[PDB]
Write a protein that binds this ligand. Sequence first.
Ligand SMILES: *C[C@@H](NCc1c(COP(=O)(O)O)cnc(C)c1O)C(=O)O
Ligand SMILES: *C[C@@H](NCc1c(COP(=O)(O)O)cnc(C)c1O)C(=O)O
Ligand SMILES: [Mg+2]
Ligand SMILES: [Mg+2]
Lengths: 319, 319
Amino acid sequence: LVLPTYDDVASASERIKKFANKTPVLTSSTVNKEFVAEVFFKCENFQKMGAFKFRGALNALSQLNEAQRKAGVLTFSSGNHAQAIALSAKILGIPAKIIMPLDAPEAKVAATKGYGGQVIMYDRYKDDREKMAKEISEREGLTIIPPYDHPHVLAGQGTAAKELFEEVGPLDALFVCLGGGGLLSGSALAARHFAPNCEVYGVEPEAGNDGQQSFRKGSIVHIDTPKTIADGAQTQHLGNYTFSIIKEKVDDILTVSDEELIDCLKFYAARMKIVVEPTGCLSFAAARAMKEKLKNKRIGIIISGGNVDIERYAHFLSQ
Amino acid sequence: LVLPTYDDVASASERIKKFANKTPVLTSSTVNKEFVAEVFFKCENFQKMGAFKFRGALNALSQLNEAQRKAGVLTFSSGNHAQAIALSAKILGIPAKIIMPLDAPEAKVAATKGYGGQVIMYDRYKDDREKMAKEISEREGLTIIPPYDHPHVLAGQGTAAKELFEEVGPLDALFVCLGGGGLLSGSALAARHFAPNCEVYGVEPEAGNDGQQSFRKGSIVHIDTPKTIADGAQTQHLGNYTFSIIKEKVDDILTVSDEELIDCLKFYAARMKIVVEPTGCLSFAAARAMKEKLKNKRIGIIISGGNVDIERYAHFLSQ
Ligand SMILES: *C[C@@H](NCc1c(COP(=O)(O)O)cnc(C)c1O)C(=O)O
Ligand SMILES: *C[C@@H](NCc1c(COP(=O)(O)O)cnc(C)c1O)C(=O)O
Ligand SMILES: [Mg+2]
Ligand SMILES: [Mg+2]
């Protein structure tokens, strides 16, 4: 397995520079005073299509040759990669078919269809979406662009962390949300380059801690689809490419409860005035849980996305 | 009445440069495509203490001499000026007494007390807060720093628009929220300097359209405290300083219903991933109402603040 390196992340910055947002970095006096540290939040919830996924989607599709682009692409996603792929595809004039979980946030399904993506659904807790993807693409001659286990995809995701380090310099610790591992693996590549001594932390919801288990065990652990509000991290196992990198460049994998996620979501709205989806609350929820360790340090927090159904979001804020 | 000019706004930029945030400017593809225009949002909901008020408070208090600072200051506010004054006062070691409406968002009262401000309350719909302010300050020897009708205060507020023009250049139109007129007057001064031909629009909630009435009539119109969710724009009349400027440098005053505000609040959360308080939704709500007029133009939208009680905010999002 030929693994991507930091070079690919740097090259990805160039391919997306034309359409991606150089998301702002926010800081909070309450957080810094509370943590007795300097905390920097990379806001991918302000990225095109509301999440960091646009980076990986565009970097991947941009490397498709003329025949591939015209032939069309296929992907499976919990919603954000689906939107990112649809948007990127429309921009490049590429036909796109997307396989989405039936219980995906309606806002994610709607944006995907609006961007021009043909949606097909699956049962997140019982269906084998990859098997569906493979067969469909094999039968229709479509190029599969995985939501995370692909060199171009993960290298692209790493551009967010790249921008964070270039804007604020080396950090003592970096917290990243963890689903399949594309964001974490890409971020780890950036971290090792800009700050080789940065502690890189992956964060998964407690019910879906396969990644953590894999990291401890040394091999990929498979679990049944986890029940959690972090709808963007219900993966059953890590990707092969992503795990190979996570295994060597990640320092630890933490978990937080849905309860902790909700408190974090309320914190973001109330104190930082931003809308963050549950999955985007993993990194900060974990950081809060270990504030004692972050005293007098510089911490980076990746805010992966803000795509939620408003009705659902209002409900969370009400807890 | 000696009116402040753009010079004061420029000098205010210097006095606050040490503690104020140079809030980011956001743009949205949905908005630009919907409006067929380039729309720039100045996010004061990311300012220190969650609103644009920090600018005017700091600029004013920074111009207090040693005796005045030690003597302490007093103010009356619906909540944001209260927080801004409290924060600014703590930074400068100034004792601060604040008069707040009993039905002010609990988050605003709490932050004011947390910043170290002594709070005293009044009945927004029946009490004469200015009379209370005058007597209390006269009896205790305190310097009154008005929430808007004061040269330093309004000049300070104008620094947000100053940053907006310096960052994106002249605009065809600028929408600003309107309560007492400090933000609008200050913004108008900045607009006339950076883009003398910019259309400057003030926006008030329909029930509290005294400002609009004043602008048409040519004199200050007084109304009973308006009932509206725009808790930051329930002023009964415009300030003397602010109206004198609004009268000469503002092109029109528009109104929007609370219903329109709620739709705007949901839009900000859903599409732009930011938390905006009802009062902060006036400017954009109006702009949407006249999109036809903004076609193929460059529009500036001031997002004045994001201070809301989460419970209340969740409730609005649920409509
Ligand atoms: C790819 C998947 N999106 C997931 C997601 C993550 C986790 O990313 P990784 O799966 O490990 O790469 C973190 N935050 C958010 C907001 C989202 O969506 C998809 O959408 O298909
Ligand atoms: C000063 C007052 N704050 C009001 C406010 C406005 C309107 O400002 P002007 O009163 O005309 O200067 C617009 N948006 C927000 C969010 C707020 O608070 C106060 O807090 O005392
Ligand atoms: Mg997992
Ligand atoms: Mg009014």
